[model samples]
Target: MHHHHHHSSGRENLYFQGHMQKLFDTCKKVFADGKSGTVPSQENIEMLRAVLDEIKPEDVGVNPKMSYFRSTVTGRSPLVTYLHIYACHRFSICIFCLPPSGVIPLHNHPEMTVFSKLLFGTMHIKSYDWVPDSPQPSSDTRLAKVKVDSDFTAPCDTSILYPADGGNMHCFTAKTACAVLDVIGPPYSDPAGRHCTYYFDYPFSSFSVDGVVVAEEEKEGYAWLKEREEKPEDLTVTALMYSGP
Candidate 1:
């Protein structure tokens, strides 16, 4: 099920010229044919995930020796750095490199499908999906059901998020310095109503005054997510050029 073909030309081909090219080509083929707001079929998503699973941290120039990979500085240095790989109107490929204890706060991906492949190290992911027909606590807050609240090590299966389900909103915290490759379809465009939004979560038990009640047995699995007007001031994401094939 892997595509590791050798070139007949025999000339030295860049690393990207191989599987990376296959990854990009597959993305283009899968995402480009559809119109905006259209979700790729389950078959197409599996196709993209297959290609993404073949990628590794070194394939995108990320390693333990990289300064950013080793950085653990807080307060002054950026918490996370992003490596730009490729992008077009249909989809975008990038990597988010975080130092130990770095956090990428809870956020939502609106009307888009995202594929995340952990390339190296360990990360804790907490994700939620809006509760269907749930009542709102306030103008800025809504109820969400917990989906994934677990830690993932590198070489794990690629995770997928859809427009309305499949944990559309999630957060990441690096347990060790780690890097994650992300493939987002129909890249976020503010004017197009796909702007990223941040949130702060309040456990169900903490919102008794709001008249939003969850049974005690289910309390631990639900929360009120209040939207933040601005991005977290502590989140500093700088862009790094992709130097790998």
Candidate 2:
């Protein structure tokens, strides 16, 4: 693993111990904003944006090359920004910093929670919903490649997600090498941790194929991702699913 951590100033509340503190603080804000009720507030959204501005990508060094230029597009070239961050109650929190040509295979959280934010960079996110086209799988079942809308469109032109509003059930691909702030529910820890189930994206393309770099294919909800990986019983999960079909 490449360990390139950015330096943070000891400016008390201004600077965090490292990226982890900023991530934890963001989660704290989310919980506080939603604790009173169910969803987050406008204030919370603004605060999130504030968090986005506070941290420079170099500080974490998750994706250093693009850190300096994520905010604005320069001479038809895109810049880098903070990474995507995710956190779920007892599940997991992930900051995905992918290169321009990187792809995250279609996966799920099953019975868990998922929250994500794009600090910078635009991404084409495609989501699929499971239909009762066939008999339902076991309860709280994870979805895989079944069949979905062959038609899809880009949601936003920027990296930062407004909230959990655009649409759920989706996979993300980057237009450029950018950082994402993400979080999973349930806190993936020991027996209390959640499992990250896999779903085989239909018509899958193996690794890098030809000149086409991005992974593209229309797929519906299926059982488990066919090409699944052995996930640790530790922090690795996406969402909490429902009890029934």
Candidate 3:
């Protein structure tokens, strides 16, 4: 474990911390226009991904004493763990840890771009996008949907999502104990025009093409996603104190 040297600031910082600072600076420049280019361009995504790829679980200061596929805390608490790393007006970064069978339910990142890197273990990712030109493009309306749901394991490629594309709403289930590093732009804030939203996926039974049930990814209008009033119980995301540079 390389400790970050105590300096006012400079290259002497730990390898991961220095890269994270570089990532923050890059995000500040790319996401300047929050509305039009809230999502960083592909080039910027590549740049950030490159920096994140240099990082490891030890770099972010993951608890070495904790179980690989489980959390240190047990009993009535939620299985999902969130380790908040850094945040600002431009971007925020957090590390998420989940035990086997842990889940984070369907949720939305309002008008934001998110980058996720699977640190280790196995996870199932299900994501969806809003139907363009729907009955209500803005506000609480669920006229149609589109999805790109899949599964992933450690040492996989980074996942990127935008305000419109790359599936804005998503869910996660851990097949094995795993961790993910998430970089979010213009962190969620109601007053700042970014609010987190949750949902439930209800497929339309009568609209199947064949005898088989219609998949949400097949087409729009096959499923109606209803807004969830409160956060899910089993999938509650609780934070742990970050012990990283």
Candidate 4:
């Protein structure tokens, strides 16, 4: 079952604005329950993907190499700035602008769905999935196996990540000055235990000659992860006002 969300009007960028409304409505319908059990269907993902693919830098008022100074206030901003477009109880849409060689640390989205669209430039994404204790190694902290470690150059298809399947914990590095429009469902809340968790990867000792996924699972580039608190060195973000209608 799907519910309708009120669509807003008065968008200056008509095409982009209308698409955004469609995206929001579809996302709200899919994630109405605010849990992964209400995961978006392929149809919903496609609709949302279309809107994100159509998004451009100017649509959200993002500028290249736009530096946001945080000297004015202590702990006020991050190395990168998030151009917040719209956010609500059900979803959040923001543009992450990164300078050359900038990186968003490896982090996990607790029980949420994430959709990413690289508007322009190049970005390398590293993703991992939690490995259940099944013929696995002994450890104290959580362990994860690699899922995706690839470099993406837009215009590329929007990537989708579910709570479990799509390697929920991931990191991003901008090969150049780049920006990504991200749509996250059921936005993070610490009290709700749905907050982001950061992790550091510990590489495996050896691998097969080919370096591909093998039956022993050694080819997947396995790694052990330890959860860590938000460090001061993590990329910081400044907030930007939404310029859309």
Candidate 5:
């Protein structure tokens, strides 16, 4: 009594559905236990990136004709909006849309691996990783090395960050209205001590008393990152339902 229909002919435009399913399955296999402190292999990371690289804006219900996409430049919508695609205890997939000049504050991903794919438009990404054995100048502040400070446009390679290094803490600024697809493994769980934490970065010169001297050539690659007790007051993200395949 097997009923597999070969004549499901109306599925031509729903390729994204298949890709989403594949992504979910791959995430499950790679992030099996959803346990903290576990990292995925480079091969597994490549697998996820391959899938993400194939994704396009329209595949996830984003297009130039949409009202929100248009309102982004007009200041008629929130600075950032989230489109919930799929989620489970092992992993979650979502899209963050931003208006022109919008910003996603600097934040850390605790014991998590993140894959980011730009669906459209251009954005500036600044990221950092803690400097090993660096002295902490204060209770909530730590020295970090700049990992990335560059602009990215769509059709670019997907980016990955690990639990500790690989730009574990980062921020995003939309140079143009943009959408970024993010696949986060073992999504933030407060009780699991994997909650999101924000930070403010101060240049190395601000703490000269610490006697930390950064080489002139590497002066722009270091900063004191201070953890914030609360997220920025101006940062607002509204959620929207995913209406795509």
Candidate 6:
């Protein structure tokens, strides 16, 4: 029972100056012609629903992100607490460098591709839009997760980037303190070999700050990473701070 969404700053600066590289070149042409099992085409969900409707928050890009806490979690929940996207062919993007308070648990991925844009943080993006199966099915059909909530929580309401029309088995919490630009898509097809699959939104009820959990499933939180082997600077860090040619 929580709802929010507000757009129209001339349609959010016309979605950050008329379409941010047409949503990163239609999400790199739907991840370079996505194929091999399916469920991702409507022209790649209308080119990522037209570049996630223009992702705002000053369109993230004033780099100065840094992280240092090591030995948190790696390789199959060694003990939880970690960070590393590490994987990309030519390019990708990132942000989520929270510290003014943090929380970015609840995970999932079974065929790569994601797009979020909050830029300077200040979030509350609690998503869970997976629902759609079950009524007379069985191939383990699943869907109906629904929890696509949002927040930019007034800094003049950031709205935390939008237009894919929100919701997708989500995670993002750092209200009065934040970060997010974490974009990925085949950015790590098989790197770390774990491909990506993390979740813990089962009847959640978390709320803490200076002690952890800017927001996300509690009671069972831990799992920063669990594999590694593909590299492209492991996906962003602006190519480890920069390396243009």
CA lDDT, candidate 1, residue 166 = 84
The local distance difference test score of each candidate is: 0.77, 0.41, 0.66, 0.67, 0.74, 0.40
Which segments of candidate 1 are over 4 A away from where they belong?
A: 1-15, 76-78, 209-213, 232-236, 239-245
Give the alpha carbon lDDT tens digit for every residue of 1-245 in model 2: 00011222122343346656776677565554332123445575556555544555455455435333233433432222222233234323446654453445454444333455555565556555443233323344433343323322222122222212232245556666555555543333234433344444443333222332222343212323243563331121221233245
lDDT accuracy of residue 152 in candidate 2: 22
Q: Considering only N, C-alpha and C atoms within 3 Å, which residue pairs clash in candidate 3?
A: 69-177
Residue runs of model 6 more than 4 Å from their true location after superposition: 1-19, 22-30, 34-56, 59-105, 115-117, 122-170, 177-198, 201-245
lDDT of 4 by residue, 23-93 (tens): 66666666665343356777877777777777666666666645532223344323665665556667777
TM-score of each: 0.86, 0.45, 0.74, 0.76, 0.84, 0.26
* Candidate 4 TM-score to native: 0.76
Each candidate: RMSD to true structure?
Answer: 7.1, 13.3, 7.1, 7.2, 8.0, 18.1
lDDT minimum window of 10 residues, candidate 1: 1-10
Model 6: worst 10 consecutive residues (lDDT sum): 1-10
- Candidate 5 residue lDDT tens string, 122-143: 9999999998777787879999
Task: Report the lDDT tens digits of candidate 6 across residue range 1-245.
Answer: 00011112112122223445565555456655434323345666555755664566455333323332112433421111122322234224444454433455544544444555555545666665443322312222232344455566423322221212244345555644454555555443444342434444433222222323313453233122222232321221211335345
Residues 125-216, candidate 3: write the lDDT tens digits. 98888766544322554644556657797777677888877888888888877788888876776667665777877665433333234445
Question: How good is model 1 by TM-score?
Answer: 0.86
What would the per-residue lDDT of candidate 1 be over residues 91-153, giving only the tens digit for each residue?
777777888887778888888898998888899999999987766757788889999999998
Candidate 5: residue pairs that collide? none
- Cα deviation at 49, candidate 1, in Å, is 0.9
Order the numbered candidates by lDDT, best leading: 1, 5, 4, 3, 2, 6
